[PDB]
Design an enzyme around this catalytic site. Structure first.
Site, short mmCIF file in Angstrom:
data_model
loop_
_atom_site.label_atom_id
_atom_site.label_comp_id
_atom_site.label_asym_id
_atom_site.label_seq_id
_atom_site.Cartn_x
_atom_site.Cartn_y
_atom_site.Cartn_z
N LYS A 27 -1.16 33.63 -12.12
CA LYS A 27 -2.04 32.59 -12.68
C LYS A 27 -3.37 32.52 -11.93
O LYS A 27 -3.48 33.06 -10.85
CB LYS A 27 -1.30 31.25 -12.70
CG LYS A 27 -0.17 31.24 -13.73
CD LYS A 27 0.61 29.92 -13.82
CE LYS A 27 1.66 30.01 -14.94
NZ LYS A 27 2.53 28.79 -15.07
N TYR A 54 0.19 28.30 -23.55
CA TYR A 54 0.77 26.97 -23.39
C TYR A 54 1.15 26.34 -24.74
O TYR A 54 0.81 25.19 -25.05
CB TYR A 54 -0.20 26.10 -22.58
CG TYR A 54 -0.37 26.59 -21.15
CD1 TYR A 54 0.67 26.46 -20.22
CD2 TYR A 54 -1.56 27.19 -20.73
CE1 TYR A 54 0.53 26.91 -18.93
CE2 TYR A 54 -1.71 27.64 -19.44
CZ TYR A 54 -0.67 27.48 -18.54
OH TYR A 54 -0.80 27.92 -17.26
N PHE A 99 -1.32 16.65 -20.12
CA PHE A 99 -1.79 17.92 -19.60
C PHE A 99 -1.61 18.95 -20.70
O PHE A 99 -0.59 18.98 -21.39
CB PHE A 99 -1.04 18.33 -18.33
CG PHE A 99 0.47 18.42 -18.48
CD1 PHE A 99 1.10 19.67 -18.54
CD2 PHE A 99 1.27 17.27 -18.52
CE1 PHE A 99 2.50 19.77 -18.67
CE2 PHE A 99 2.67 17.36 -18.66
CZ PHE A 99 3.28 18.62 -18.72
N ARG A 136 12.37 36.75 -12.73
CA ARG A 136 12.26 35.30 -12.59
C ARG A 136 12.97 34.75 -11.36
O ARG A 136 12.62 33.70 -10.86
CB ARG A 136 12.70 34.56 -13.85
CG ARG A 136 11.54 34.35 -14.85
CD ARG A 136 11.96 33.43 -16.00
NE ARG A 136 10.80 32.86 -16.66
CZ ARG A 136 10.76 31.65 -17.21
NH1 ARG A 136 11.83 30.86 -17.18
NH2 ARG A 136 9.62 31.24 -17.78
N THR A 176 10.91 27.57 -12.08
CA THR A 176 9.58 27.33 -12.67
C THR A 176 8.79 26.17 -12.02
O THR A 176 7.56 26.21 -11.89
CB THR A 176 9.70 27.25 -14.21
OG1 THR A 176 10.12 28.54 -14.70
CG2 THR A 176 8.39 26.91 -14.87
N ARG A 191 7.32 31.27 -5.71
CA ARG A 191 6.99 29.87 -5.83
C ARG A 191 7.62 29.10 -4.67
O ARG A 191 7.05 28.11 -4.17
CB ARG A 191 7.45 29.32 -7.15
CG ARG A 191 6.73 29.89 -8.33
CD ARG A 191 7.08 29.11 -9.56
NE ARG A 191 6.46 29.62 -10.77
CZ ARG A 191 7.13 30.24 -11.73
NH1 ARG A 191 8.43 30.45 -11.61
NH2 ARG A 191 6.50 30.66 -12.81
N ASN A 210 1.48 26.51 -10.22
CA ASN A 210 2.65 27.22 -9.78
C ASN A 210 2.51 28.73 -9.73
O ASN A 210 3.53 29.45 -9.72
CB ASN A 210 3.87 26.80 -10.60
CG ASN A 210 3.94 27.48 -11.93
OD1 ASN A 210 2.95 28.05 -12.43
ND2 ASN A 210 5.13 27.45 -12.53
N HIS A 218 3.92 33.63 -13.59
CA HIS A 218 4.70 33.46 -14.80
C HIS A 218 5.50 34.71 -15.10
O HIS A 218 4.99 35.83 -14.95
CB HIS A 218 3.81 33.16 -16.00
CG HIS A 218 4.49 33.38 -17.31
ND1 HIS A 218 5.42 32.50 -17.82
CD2 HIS A 218 4.41 34.40 -18.20
CE1 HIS A 218 5.87 32.96 -18.98
NE2 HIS A 218 5.27 34.11 -19.23
N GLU A 223 5.16 39.08 -25.25
CA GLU A 223 4.10 38.86 -24.27
C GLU A 223 3.47 40.18 -23.90
O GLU A 223 2.25 40.26 -23.69
CB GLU A 223 4.64 38.08 -23.07
CG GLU A 223 5.24 36.73 -23.46
CD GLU A 223 5.62 35.83 -22.28
OE1 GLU A 223 5.77 34.59 -22.48
OE2 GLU A 223 5.76 36.33 -21.15
#
Lengths: 150, 140, 150, 151, 150, 151
Positions: F11, F51, F59, F87, F93, F104, F114, F117, F128
């Site tokens: 990110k 998102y 948000f 992950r 997450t 993380r 965070n 992804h 994706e």
């Protein structure tokens, strides 16, 4: 030897999170930590830190920056710790710094060079007295003093 | 290819927990580990004041044999200058040692001395012949 | 400045899982990653040569290897990033390379020396253009820039 | 939420075993903010207060002897859930239960040499922080990364 | 505290340059290395090493492979240690390992799970007896023992 | 079996906080194979789309603003279980939950920021990867260590 040097993390080093790495390298060498403090230097303090300077001096900035925020100041003890400290830190100017040194690894600009080391034994004596009260130096023995030295 | 050097973590490196750190530096360089033994040296084995027999044989060491081009010199580069005061940051003695007396590791001075030193510390047998699956990535 | 350079992770370097390692040394010196992508070089893409070029001892199969799997190409920006970039990579020949540098730490053979960095501000400009659509390439401002430079 | 402060000390075994930089760097890089830092040998009075709880020997006079037998490194850190997060970073109190990746998980074997302490609540944190540091030792500054770390 | 386990870097770990890394993790924990060697198992030894099969023909595969090349074998001593060691390794099955553990950080596949440690104090002494001649086994005192225990 | 491919993005907070190298380096060390890699600046549309199961939240406007605020680094990693493995390496997450040892876990504090992804499923990954990349950016190569990592 119980030679001592004064090592600071300048505020640019604190800002970009190099306090731990720096202490760790000294610790890994076998030097001993006898004083550690986080404090934001006075304008006054900053002025005496630099006491030279200059033509171009500014200077006035290097004072502004140095008191812009927190430093972590240190006292390290060991045989050739003043010399050896300078080697750990690298060339004052990061562009002339050997790789695998603090500035060598983590700094570009001479004006934002991350840390400070005393250049001579007497320079350290002056410096420690300046930054640290006698009672803030801890006298202790490393369980490992006889594995580092004879 | 196929030059071999002998490396040892002295008792002071073993006490100060630098065995993984030394081995790892050799492994990532691309050198191949070929023999590995922890042993306590015994009196005699002192090679040529005269402490360094109480010392060099006061505790275990890790002996090793490493294999690759330029491994004598490269290995010694890795350790850095014999004298820690002369050793540079990035090197083992530079990063980790202070005193000549307590200089952590050891590296064979010549291709010649290496083979004397390998022979001395190892049966020709404890010495493993294998091929790294990366040999072709590290070398031509 | 602001000066940019071209760094490549060679197929052996990708193969030996040194991509994160390399990237991280540059991030950590304070340099700024401005473009980045993985690709397999085509054979006339391959270098092209025209460094040497006058091809030259035995190009044929130096250009065969450079094209034989993926490389990671990157463009980093900062004062002296060209010169400092080469510093982090270390002496072009792995045997000259000091521990603490990418080649010094990870490379044994010139024929398999993990990475390449542009050799001058001028070579950079070109190599950057040859590898990157002038728009694969991001202009951003690091939240740390004030900390890295005065 | 974000100005929350916690107290973290490397204990005398941790200082001896050269883990001051290790621990600090785990905190800086989680995104927490170093707000105070010093080295001291705890005094016997400081050492008794740390372990008032137990007194009630168990290893009282022992724990007190140990904790004030050498230097510790005190720190105050600041961030969202830094109290809860710090302890997560340090690993479970009993090293035998702590997981690799955490300070005690990585470097500690027995509870009476568990390398460090961290405050166990907002209210015990605030106390310990008040206890160990004069308020003019708490430096008030802003990380240039605070907007990278929080919304 | 006397309790000892056997730890082995399997051929994948030796191949994948994970021998120092594993050692480091046990030194950093405070465990003491009381034996160490590199050897290439025979099929006999790999066959014994496996209680196991019985099978599903993953025995035999385990048995080859494991005798495919050299293992690094170690004995560690600390307030046991057998359990604590397995914890440093991570769940035997890599799909179940958490980051931080050896298998957590480096392994994907159960057949290539990098390393081994004895599952019980009694299992440990078989393995130690099996792999080591009783005099390949230095009894010494870490100068740090009093800092790692009371 | 597999093979199998997931999508990992640093990110823009993660890029800013100089953790591209660290993140890539964990996937490498784990045995996964990097088959695509580019840095780009997300456009509002790309941001807005990322998102998506989140478009009716307070948000969002701020998350979109943030995600397109500066460069990210997108990756395609290949290997057995990589979607689920990728992950795990990443950690819960929400940082407050993630364990030291994980990205993380080691490096993040709040959900807004965070750092990274990973696709949550085999299918998400395939959405994706097709979205962020073009097939020709997706190299096909064989790791010299593949035999050492998979039985």
């Amino acid at each position: 030897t119980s030679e001592r040097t004064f090592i600071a993390v300048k505020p640019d080093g604190v800002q970009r999170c190099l306090v731990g790495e720096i202490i760790q390298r000294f610790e890994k060498k076998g030097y001993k930590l006898v004083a550690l403090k986080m404090l934001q230097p006075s304008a006054e303090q900053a002025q005496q830190h630099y006491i030279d300077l200059a033509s171009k001096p500014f200077y006035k900035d290097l004072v502004a920056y140095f008191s812009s925020g927190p430093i972590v100041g240190m006292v390290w003890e060991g045989k050739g710790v003043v010399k050896g400290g300078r080697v750990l830190l690298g060339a004052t100017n990061p562009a002339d710094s050997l790789p695998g040194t603090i500035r060598g690894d983590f700094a570009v600009d001479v004006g934002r060079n991350v840390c400070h080391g005393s250049d001579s034994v007497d320079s350290a004596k002056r410096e420690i007295a300046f930054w640290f009260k006698p009672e803030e130096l801890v006298n202790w023995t490393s369980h490992s003093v006889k594995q580092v030295y004879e």
